[PDB]
Coordinates of C-alpha atoms and ligand atoms in Angstrom, one line a residue:
Chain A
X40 CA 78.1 -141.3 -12.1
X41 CA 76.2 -138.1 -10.7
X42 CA 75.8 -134.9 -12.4
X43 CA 76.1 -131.8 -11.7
X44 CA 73.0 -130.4 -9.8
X45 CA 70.1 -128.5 -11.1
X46 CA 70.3 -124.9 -10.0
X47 CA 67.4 -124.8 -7.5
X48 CA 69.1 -128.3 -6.1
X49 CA 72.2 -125.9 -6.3
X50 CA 70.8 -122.9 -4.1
X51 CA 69.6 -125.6 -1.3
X52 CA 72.9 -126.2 -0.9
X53 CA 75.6 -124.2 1.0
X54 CA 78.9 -123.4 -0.4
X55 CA 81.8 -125.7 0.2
X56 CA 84.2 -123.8 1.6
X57 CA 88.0 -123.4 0.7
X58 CA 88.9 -125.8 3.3
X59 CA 88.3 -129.8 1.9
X60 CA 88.3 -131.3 5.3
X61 CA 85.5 -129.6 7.0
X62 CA 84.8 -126.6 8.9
X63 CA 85.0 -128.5 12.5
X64 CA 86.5 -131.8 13.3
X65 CA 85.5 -131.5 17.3
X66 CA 88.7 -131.3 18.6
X67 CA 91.1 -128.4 19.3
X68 CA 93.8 -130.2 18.2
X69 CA 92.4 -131.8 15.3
X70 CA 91.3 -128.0 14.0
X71 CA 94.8 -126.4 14.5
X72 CA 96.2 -129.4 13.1
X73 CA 93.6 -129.4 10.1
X74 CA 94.3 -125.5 9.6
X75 CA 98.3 -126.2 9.9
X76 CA 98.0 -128.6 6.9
X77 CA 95.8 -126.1 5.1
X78 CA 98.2 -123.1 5.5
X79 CA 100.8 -125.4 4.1
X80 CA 99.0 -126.8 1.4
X81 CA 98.1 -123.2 0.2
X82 CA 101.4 -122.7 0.4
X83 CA 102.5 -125.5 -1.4
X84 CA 99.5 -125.7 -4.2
X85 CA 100.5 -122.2 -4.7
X86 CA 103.9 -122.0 -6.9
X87 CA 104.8 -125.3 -7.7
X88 CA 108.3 -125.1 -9.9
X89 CA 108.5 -127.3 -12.5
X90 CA 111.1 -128.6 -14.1
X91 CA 112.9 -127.6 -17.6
X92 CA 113.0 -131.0 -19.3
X93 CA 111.6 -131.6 -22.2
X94 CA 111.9 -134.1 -23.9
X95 CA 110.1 -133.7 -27.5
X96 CA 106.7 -132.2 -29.4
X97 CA 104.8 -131.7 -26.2
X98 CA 107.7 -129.7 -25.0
X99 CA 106.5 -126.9 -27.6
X100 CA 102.8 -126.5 -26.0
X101 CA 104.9 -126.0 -22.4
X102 CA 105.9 -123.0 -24.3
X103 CA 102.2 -121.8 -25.0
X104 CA 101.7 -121.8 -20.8
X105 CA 105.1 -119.8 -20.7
X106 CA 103.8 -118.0 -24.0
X107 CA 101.5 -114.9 -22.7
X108 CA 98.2 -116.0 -23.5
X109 CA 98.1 -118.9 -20.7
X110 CA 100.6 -117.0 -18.1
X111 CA 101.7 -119.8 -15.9
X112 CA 103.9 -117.3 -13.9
X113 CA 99.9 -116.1 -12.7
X114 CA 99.3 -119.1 -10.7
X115 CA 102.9 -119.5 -9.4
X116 CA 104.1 -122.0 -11.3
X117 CA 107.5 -121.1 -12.8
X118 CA 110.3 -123.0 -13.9
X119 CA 113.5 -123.4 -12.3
X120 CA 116.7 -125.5 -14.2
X121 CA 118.2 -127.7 -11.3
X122 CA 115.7 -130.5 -10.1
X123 CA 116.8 -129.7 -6.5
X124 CA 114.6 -126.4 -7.1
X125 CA 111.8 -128.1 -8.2
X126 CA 108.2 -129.7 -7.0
X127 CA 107.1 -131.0 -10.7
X128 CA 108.7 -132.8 -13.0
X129 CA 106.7 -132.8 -16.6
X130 CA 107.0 -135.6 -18.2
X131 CA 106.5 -134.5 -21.7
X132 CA 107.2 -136.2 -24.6
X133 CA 108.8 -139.5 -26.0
X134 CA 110.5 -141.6 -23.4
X135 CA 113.1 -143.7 -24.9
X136 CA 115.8 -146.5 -23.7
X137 CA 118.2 -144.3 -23.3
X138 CA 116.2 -141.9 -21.3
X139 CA 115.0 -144.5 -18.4
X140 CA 118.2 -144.0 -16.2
X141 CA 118.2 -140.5 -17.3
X142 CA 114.4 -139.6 -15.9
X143 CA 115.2 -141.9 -12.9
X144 CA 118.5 -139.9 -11.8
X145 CA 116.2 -136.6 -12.5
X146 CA 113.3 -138.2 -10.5
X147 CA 115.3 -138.8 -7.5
X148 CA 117.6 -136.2 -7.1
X149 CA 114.1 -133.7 -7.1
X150 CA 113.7 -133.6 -3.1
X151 CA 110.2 -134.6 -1.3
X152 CA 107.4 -133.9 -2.0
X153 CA 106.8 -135.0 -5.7
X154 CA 104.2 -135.1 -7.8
X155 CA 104.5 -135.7 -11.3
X156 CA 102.6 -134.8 -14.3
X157 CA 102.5 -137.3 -17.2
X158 CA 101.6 -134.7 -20.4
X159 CA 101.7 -136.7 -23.5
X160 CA 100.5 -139.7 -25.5
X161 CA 104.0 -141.0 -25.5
X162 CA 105.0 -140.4 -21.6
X163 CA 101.7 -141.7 -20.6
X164 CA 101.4 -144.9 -22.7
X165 CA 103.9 -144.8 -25.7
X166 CA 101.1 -143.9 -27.7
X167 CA 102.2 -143.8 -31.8
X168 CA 105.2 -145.2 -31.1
X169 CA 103.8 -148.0 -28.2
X170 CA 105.2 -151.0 -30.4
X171 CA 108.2 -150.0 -30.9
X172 CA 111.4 -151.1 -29.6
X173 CA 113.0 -148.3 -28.0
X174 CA 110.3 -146.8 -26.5
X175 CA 109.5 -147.2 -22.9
X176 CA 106.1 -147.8 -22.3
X177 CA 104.8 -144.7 -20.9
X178 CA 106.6 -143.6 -17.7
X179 CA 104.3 -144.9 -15.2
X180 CA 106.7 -148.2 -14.7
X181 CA 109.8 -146.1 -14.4
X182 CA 108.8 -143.2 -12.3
X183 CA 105.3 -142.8 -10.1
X184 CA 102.5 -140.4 -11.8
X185 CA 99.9 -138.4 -10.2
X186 CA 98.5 -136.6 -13.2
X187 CA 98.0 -137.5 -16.6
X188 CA 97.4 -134.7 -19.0
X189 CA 95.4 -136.8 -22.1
X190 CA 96.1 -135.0 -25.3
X191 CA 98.5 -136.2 -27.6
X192 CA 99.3 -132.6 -28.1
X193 CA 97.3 -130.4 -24.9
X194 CA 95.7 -127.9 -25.5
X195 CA 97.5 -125.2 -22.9
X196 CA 93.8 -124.7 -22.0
X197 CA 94.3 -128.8 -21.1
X198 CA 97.5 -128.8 -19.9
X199 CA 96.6 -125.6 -17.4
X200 CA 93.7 -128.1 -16.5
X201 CA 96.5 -130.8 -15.4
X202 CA 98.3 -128.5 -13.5
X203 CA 95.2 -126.8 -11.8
X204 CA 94.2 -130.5 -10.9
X205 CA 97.7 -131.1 -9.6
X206 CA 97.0 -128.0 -7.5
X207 CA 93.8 -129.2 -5.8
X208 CA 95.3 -132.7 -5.3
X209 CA 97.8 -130.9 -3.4
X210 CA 95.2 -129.0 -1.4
X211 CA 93.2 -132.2 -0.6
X212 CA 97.1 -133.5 0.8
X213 CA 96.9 -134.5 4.4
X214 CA 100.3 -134.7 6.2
X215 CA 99.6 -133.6 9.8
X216 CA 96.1 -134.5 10.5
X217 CA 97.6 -138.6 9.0
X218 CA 100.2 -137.9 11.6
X219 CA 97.5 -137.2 14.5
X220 CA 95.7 -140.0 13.6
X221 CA 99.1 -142.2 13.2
Chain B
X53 CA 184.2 -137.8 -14.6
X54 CA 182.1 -138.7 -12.0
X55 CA 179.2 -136.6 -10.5
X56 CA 181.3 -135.8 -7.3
X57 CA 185.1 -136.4 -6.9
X58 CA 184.8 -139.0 -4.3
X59 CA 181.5 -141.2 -4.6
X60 CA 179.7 -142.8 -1.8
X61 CA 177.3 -145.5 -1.6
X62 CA 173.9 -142.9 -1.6
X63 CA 176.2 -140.6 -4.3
X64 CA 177.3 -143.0 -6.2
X65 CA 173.9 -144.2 -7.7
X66 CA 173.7 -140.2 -9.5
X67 CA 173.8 -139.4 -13.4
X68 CA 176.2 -137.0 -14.4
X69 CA 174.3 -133.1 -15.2
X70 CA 174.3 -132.3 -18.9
X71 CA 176.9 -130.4 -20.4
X72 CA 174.6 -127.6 -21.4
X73 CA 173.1 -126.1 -18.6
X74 CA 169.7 -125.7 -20.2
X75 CA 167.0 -129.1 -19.8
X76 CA 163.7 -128.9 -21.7
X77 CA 160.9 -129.6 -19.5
X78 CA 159.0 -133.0 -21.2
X79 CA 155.7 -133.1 -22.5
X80 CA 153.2 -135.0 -20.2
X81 CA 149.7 -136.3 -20.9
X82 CA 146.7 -133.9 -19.9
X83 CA 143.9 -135.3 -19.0
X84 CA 140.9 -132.6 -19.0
X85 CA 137.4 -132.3 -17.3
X86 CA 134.9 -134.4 -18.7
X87 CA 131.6 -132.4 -18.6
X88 CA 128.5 -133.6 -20.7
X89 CA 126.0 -131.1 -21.4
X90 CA 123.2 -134.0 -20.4
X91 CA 119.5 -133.9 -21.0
X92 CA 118.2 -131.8 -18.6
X93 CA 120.3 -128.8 -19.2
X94 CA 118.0 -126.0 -21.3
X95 CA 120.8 -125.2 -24.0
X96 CA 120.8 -128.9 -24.9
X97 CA 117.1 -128.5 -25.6
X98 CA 115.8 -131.2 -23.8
X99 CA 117.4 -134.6 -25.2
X100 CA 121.2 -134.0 -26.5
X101 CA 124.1 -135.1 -24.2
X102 CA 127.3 -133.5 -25.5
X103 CA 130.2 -135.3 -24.3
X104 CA 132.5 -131.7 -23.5
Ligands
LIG301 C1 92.2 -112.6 11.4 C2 93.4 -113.3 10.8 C3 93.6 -114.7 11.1 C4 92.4 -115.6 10.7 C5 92.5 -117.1 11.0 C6 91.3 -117.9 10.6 C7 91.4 -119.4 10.9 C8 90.1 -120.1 10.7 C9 89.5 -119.9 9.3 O1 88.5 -119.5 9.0 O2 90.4 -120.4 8.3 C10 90.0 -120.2 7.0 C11 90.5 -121.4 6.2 C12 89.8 -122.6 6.6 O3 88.4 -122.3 6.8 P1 87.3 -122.6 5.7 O4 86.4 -123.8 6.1 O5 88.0 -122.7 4.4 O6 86.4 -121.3 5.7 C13 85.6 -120.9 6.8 C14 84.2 -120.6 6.2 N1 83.4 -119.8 7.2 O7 91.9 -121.5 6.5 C15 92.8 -121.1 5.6 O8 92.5 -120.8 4.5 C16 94.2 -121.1 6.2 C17 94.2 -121.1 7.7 C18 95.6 -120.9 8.3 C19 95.7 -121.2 9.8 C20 97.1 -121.1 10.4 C21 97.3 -121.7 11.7 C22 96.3 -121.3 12.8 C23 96.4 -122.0 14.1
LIG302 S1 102.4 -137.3 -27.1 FE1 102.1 -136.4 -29.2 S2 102.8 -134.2 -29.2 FE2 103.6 -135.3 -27.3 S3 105.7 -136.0 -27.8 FE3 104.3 -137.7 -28.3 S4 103.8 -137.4 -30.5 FE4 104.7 -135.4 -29.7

């Protein structure tokens, strides 16, 4: 655990940058490969599509980001029906028996890359209804998860804050400078 | 009485036509498209599969 710094700690330092992997990685190759893979992670952190899914309660607060307050058409993110036209798949909401071979059909038939986000007490661990029978427990063990939004309903303020997390794990992604040193 | 005056071995296997000239075309099974409005489509609002 560290905190974060004091604000005369906070002016000896230098800003970070935009660019998570440094400024200079002494190498020509290495930089135009580093600021390849950032051009394409800006262009993939910015408009993720997400997909229409929905399957219960937290499907509502999706609404309040499409609902004008939160705005997720300002960051990019919109949604798009087919799962071929989509990055994210939302998890969101109660995942049942008979939904396993339905999310895994949707999960794999969305192309790479995929990152999903796991909004919901009941996608991420059953939550109120984790003893039940039907109920799948959570849908890490049926599909993979890179975010997990907390809130049994989010907040759009915290579901924004899964999907702008989603966004900067996409802009720490490394592709091509993992294929130079590959 | 026969279908032809003089029947031959191929001919000879035929059915005489009806006396009235009209034949009703029979009624055959249909068997139409199955389409489900599944789960992920937006006007079946999320978890509905209707079996069209
Ligand atoms: C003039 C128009 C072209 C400018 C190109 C600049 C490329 C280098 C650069 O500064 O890229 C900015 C950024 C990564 O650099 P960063 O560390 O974030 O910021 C520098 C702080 N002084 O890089 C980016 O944000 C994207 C860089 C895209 C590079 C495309 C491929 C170039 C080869
Ligand atoms: S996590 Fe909470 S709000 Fe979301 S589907 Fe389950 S019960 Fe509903």
């Amino acid at each position: 655990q560290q905190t974060l710094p004091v604000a005369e700690v906070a002016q000896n330092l230098p800003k970070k940058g935009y660019s998570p992997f440094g400024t200079k990685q002494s190498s020509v190759a290495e930089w135009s490969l580093a600021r390849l893979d950032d051009l394409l992670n800006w262009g993939r952190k910015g408009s993720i599509w997400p997909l229409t899914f929905g399957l219960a309660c937290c499907a509502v607060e999706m609404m309040h980001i499409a609902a004008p307050r939160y705005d997720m058409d300002r960051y990019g993110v919109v949604f798009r029906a087919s799962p071929r036209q989509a990055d994210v798949i939302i998890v969101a909401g109660t995942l049942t028996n008979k939904m396993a071979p339905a999310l895994r059909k949707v999960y794999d038939q969305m192309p790479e890359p995929r990152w999903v986000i796991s909004m919901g007490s009941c996608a991420n661990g059953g939550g109120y209804y984790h003893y039940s029978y039907s109920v799948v427990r959570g849908c890490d063990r049926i599909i993979p998860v890179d975010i997990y939004v907390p809130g049994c309903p989010p907040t759009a303020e915290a579901l924004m804050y899964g999907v702008l997390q989603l966004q900067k794990k996409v802009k720490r992604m490394k592709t091509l400078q993992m294929w130079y040193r590959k | 009485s026969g279908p032809v005056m003089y029947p031959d071995e191929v001919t000879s296997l035929w059915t005489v036509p009806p006396w009235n000239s009209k034949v009703t075309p029979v009624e055959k099974s249909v068997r139409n498209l199955t389409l489900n409005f599944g789960p992920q489509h937006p006007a079946a609002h999320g978890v509905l599969r209707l079996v069209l």
